[PDB]
Amino acid sequence: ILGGREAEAHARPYMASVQLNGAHLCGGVLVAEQWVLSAAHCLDGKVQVLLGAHSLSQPEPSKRLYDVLRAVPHPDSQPDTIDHDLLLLQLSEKATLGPAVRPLPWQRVDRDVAPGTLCDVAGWGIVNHAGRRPDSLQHVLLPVLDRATCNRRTHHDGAITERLMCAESNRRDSCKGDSGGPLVCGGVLEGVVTSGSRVCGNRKKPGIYTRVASYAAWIDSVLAS
Ligand SMILES: C[C@@H](NC(=O)[C@@H]1C[C@H]2C[C@H]2N1C(=O)Cn1nc(C(N)=O)c2ccncc21)c1cccc(Cl)c1F
């Protein structure tokens, strides 16, 4: 997260770190007892999910690392595109829920949110241009950027489909390692940080997030498998 601040520890109990050989790979979001939603491009290394965490490195009572029974990339995702950029990770078992570990309800109405709606993105992604990686969860409050402005020639030039949304990227932004993490608006999961490479912190190139409501049938179908 560029230009953010350290998040209050365990105040987002749905935040997950998707890990590869015990190193942070992507954000994720606990959406069901046994399921973490993330981004398609995040993923034969050992993939785990860390829940209840603030620090990646430090012992915390709430911290628990879950093996993953199944990784289910969206079957229409493709490298070289950020369409359908979701990933569902079935944990080994139902996560132990408590104050620091709780599923986040996700948006089912497939309608756009208000322009400028202040949403919250958290992650363990890079925090500056040199690539400094934070130990502790960061977050940033970002206003939603309407899709029309996001698609202007000087911006993302028509690339933003109705299944995607944008937020402002003006020095504050998601960045590398934030992919797969939550964009939370009005207390509900609205979007998932995309996981294609993109410039961070450039106000002319907004952050892109996948609209979970647009993918309800997919999510429902995979969570009930
Ligand atoms: C392990 C490795 N993880 C990744 O590269 C993940 C894993 C794989 C999906 C792709 N990834 C991304 O981040 C993709 N991505 N998304 C955004 C975005 N939306 O702004 C972005 C902007 C710029 N470049 C890549 C970007 C990592 C390297 C260094 C530090 C950290 Cl903290 C870290 F996690």
Determination technique for this PDB entry? X-ray
- In 3-state terms, the chain is what percent helix, strand and coil (to 5)? 10, 35, 55
Which of 126, 160, 179 maximizes ligand 1 atoms within 8 Å of its Cβ, making it the mutation to test the pocket? 179
Are residue 175 and residue 205 in the same domain, yes or no?
A: yes
- 128 C-beta neighbours (distance < 10 Å), count: 13
Encoded tokens for 57: 């490195």
Closest-lying ligand 1 atom to the alpha carbon of residue 198: 22
Are residue 66 and residue 79 in the same domain, yes or no?
A: yes
Q: Give catalytic residue positions.
A: 41, 85, 179
Distance 102 CA to ligand 1 centre (A): 25
Burial class (CB in 10 A: 0-12, 13-18, 19+), 3: middle
Structure's resolution in angstroms: 1.9
Our count of domains for the chain comes to 2
Distance 77 CA to ligand 1 centre (A): 17
Residues 180 and 87: beta-carbon distance below 8 Å: yes
Closest residue by Cα to atom 31, ligand 1, is: 177
Find the angle CA(89)-CA(93)-CA(99) to the nearest 5 degrees. Answer: 90
Are residue 57 and residue 153 in the same domain, yes or no?
A: no
Distance 27 CA to ligand 1 centre (A): 9
Question: Cα–chain-centroid distance for residue 206?
Answer: 15
| CA–CA distance, 189 with 112 (Å, rounded to integer) | 13
Domain that holds residue 147: 1-12+104-213
CATH of residue 124: 2.40.10.10
Are residue 45 and residue 155 in the same domain, yes or no?
A: no
| CA–CA distance, 181 with 137 (Å, rounded to integer) | 11
Are residue 80 and residue 150 in the same domain, yes or no?
A: no
Distance 153 CA to ligand 1 centre (A): 25
In this structure, the residues whose C-beta lies within 6 A of any atom of ligand 1 are: 24-26, 41-42, 124-126, 133, 174-179, 193-195, 197-198, 200
Are residue 209 and residue 117 in the same domain, yes or no?
A: yes
What three-state secondary structure class fits 149? Answer: helix
Are residue 3 and residue 113 in the same domain, yes or no?
A: yes
**At a CB cut-off of 8 Å and minimum separation 6, what does 128 contact?**
2
Are residue 19 and residue 51 in the same domain, yes or no?
A: yes
Are residue 2 and residue 112 in the same domain, yes or no?
A: yes
Are residue 43 and residue 113 in the same domain, yes or no?
A: no
Q: How far is CA 156 from CA 29, 79, 207, 214, in A?
A: 26, 18, 10, 20
Are residue 46 and residue 125 in the same domain, yes or no?
A: no
Are residue 119 and residue 177 in the same domain, yes or no?
A: yes
Closest residue by Cα to atom 34, ligand 1, is: 177
Q: How far is CA 5 from CA 8, 120, 141, in A?
A: 9, 11, 10
